[PDB]
Amino acid sequence: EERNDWHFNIGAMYEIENVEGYGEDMDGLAEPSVYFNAANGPWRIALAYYQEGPVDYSAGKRGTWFDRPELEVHYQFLENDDFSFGLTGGFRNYGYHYVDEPGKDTANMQRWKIAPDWDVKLTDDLRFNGWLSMYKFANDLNTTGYADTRVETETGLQYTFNETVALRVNYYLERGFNMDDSRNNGEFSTQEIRAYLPLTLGNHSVTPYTRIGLRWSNGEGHDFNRVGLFYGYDFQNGLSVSLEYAFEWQDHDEGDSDKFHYAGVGVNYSF
Numbered sequence: 001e002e003r004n005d006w007h008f009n010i011g012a013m014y015e016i017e018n019v020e021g022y023g024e025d026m027d028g029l030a031e032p033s034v035y036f037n038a039a040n041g042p043w044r045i046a047l048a049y050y051q052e053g054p055v056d057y058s059a060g061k062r063g064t065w066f067d068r069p070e071l072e073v074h075y076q077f078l079e080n081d082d083f084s085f086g087l088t089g090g091f092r093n094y095g096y097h098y099v100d101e102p103g104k105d106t107a108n109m110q111r112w113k114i115a116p117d118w119d120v121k122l123t124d125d126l127r128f129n130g131w132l133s134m135y136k137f138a139n140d141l142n143t144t145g146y147a148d149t150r151v152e153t154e155t156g157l158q159y160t161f162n163e164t165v166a167l168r169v170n171y172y173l174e175r176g177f178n179m180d181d182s183r184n185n186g187e188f189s190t191q192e193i194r195a196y197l198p199l200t201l202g203n204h205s206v207t208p209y210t211r212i213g214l215r216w217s218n219g220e221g222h223d224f225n226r227v228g229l230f231y232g233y234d235f236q237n238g239l240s241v242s243l244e245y246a247f248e249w250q251d252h253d254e255g256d257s258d259k260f261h262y263a264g265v266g267v268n269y270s271f
Helices: none
Strands: 008-016 033-040 043-049 073-076 085-094 108-116 118-121 128-131 134-137 153-162 167-177 186-198 200-201 204-212 228-232 239-247 263-270
Touching: 167 200
Parallel strands: none
Antiparallel strands: 008 033, 008 263, 033 043, 043 073, 073 085, 085 108, 085 118, 108 134, 118 128, 128 153, 153 167, 167 186, 186 204, 200 204, 204 228, 228 239, 239 263
């Protein structure tokens, strides 16, 4: 059926950028990103573009730029009030440029995203959800050393705490395997727990992120629960601003050229 609604969603994202800074002998790099979402009934399109606009200072010879086009296809299947259905898609492609030794030095690879949506209502205060992200398209002749074609599993549950306070959990599962190789335990299986609690209150959106630690790696790395933070402010409802803040890993190093913070800023709008 052709559902009627018509809705658009456009947002952006930047890190630091030439706006707020303090230093007369150092600088960083800003990576501006864009997002374009189109809502048309059961069919929901979503795409995102990347870019880079750092400060030039005569690095090598020429400046070679590179972009990464991303697409997505959302589809609603539905079935019952308790259990729902859906279909999600994605398109990833990266271009390779080698201006060091000309001679038809160029590769070609793609990435198909396929992750359906599953919903299961067990109670009025218990919302279950799960979806497996599969990636298949390119063979990766050089990237074969790690991965290229494999299936992933990422579930997500929602538990309502209060009328103006909710909770959300997520279980990440990594997977790896070659197209065809005589192995017994070559496949990799990693697990990462990540949860966030959505807090809706007036014109202020704050969804803290929880991350457990002290359950992996020899040395120390993870600590405390609240490591992430999701901000949200809409001075006009439609237009809002989201900010991602983290506090994981230890900051014990020095430099004078490279530097990356643990925060993020972005915008969102609807037509």
